[PDB]
Amino acid sequence: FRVVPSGDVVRFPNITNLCPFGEVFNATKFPSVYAWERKRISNCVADYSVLYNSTSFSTFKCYGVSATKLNDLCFSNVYADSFVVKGDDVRQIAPGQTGVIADYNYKLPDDFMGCVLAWNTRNIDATSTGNYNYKYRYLRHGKLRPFERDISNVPFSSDGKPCTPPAPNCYWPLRGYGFYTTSGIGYQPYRVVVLSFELLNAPATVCGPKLSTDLIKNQCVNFNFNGLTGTGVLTPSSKRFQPFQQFGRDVSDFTDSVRDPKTSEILDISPCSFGGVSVITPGTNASSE
């Protein structure tokens, strides 16, 4: 026996402020790649269309999610990483790459989920005489692990023993980019922002621009809770979630309960179609009843 939905429910958390797009993408200063910086994002609306009038991105690539779904989701545990690299080095900011940057400066995990953005900043970060304030590490014993940073400045020797800078086989491990106004595109500065997050498994406080509705109970409806969409019947629940739990699951891994993001009430979710049906016929040759 089949039943079709006759309603629509959308439940997102109470959010008023717009996310700090200006602070992140329009900051006056950016850090060196070897000292990349991290910032937490929470309790804001991710309405990225506001960027359309002010920014143009050479690189934009997302992992674990389709770019056309971003407006319909809520994101958990959101961080933004910022730094500056050379034009030829941008390709290295991606899972499973090799090279100086990916080996010694900044590495992404193999199962990365998030997005990578990059844009040219020659007019801002390049000067006619050459700007050398941005630096990267080009010597190290071993490779970095994902989301690891190393900001030491110990003089380097292949032998591995301590050395003094003015001596053979002893080098300073940090080198300076040379950004000139007349440089080719491959040697021009680029600003990079890496966003990381998790989806549909835990509490969230960053969401896309969407209008929440009222809660309909004891009725087959389409529902959207913090981005998780489906169809079913919602009822009050006796389960008691812990503060760090947002969804519940049964032995089939079907999502069977959820905490409402506005009232914190626990709701059970049940399928709409249920029941066995049989048809008795005397034969179509004899009748159609």
């Binding site: 999610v65 089939s252 891994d253």
Partner: protein, 48 residues
């Protein structure tokens, strides 16, 4: 007779439990797949 009953029940319950396998897809939850992915890749995962 008891084990006839038990075998039938166990078969059905195993059928219910086997819905939690990924079969190589990114997830075993159709709702999660359709909430995250657009139609083109959702089709591959759902086919698996």
């Amino acid at each position: 007779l008891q084990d006839v009953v038990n075998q039938n029940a166990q078969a059905l319950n195993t059928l219910v439990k086997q819905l939690s396998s990924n079969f190589g897809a990114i997830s075993s939850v159709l709702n999660d797949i359709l909430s995250r992915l657009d139609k083109v890749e959702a089709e591959v995962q759902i086919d698996r």
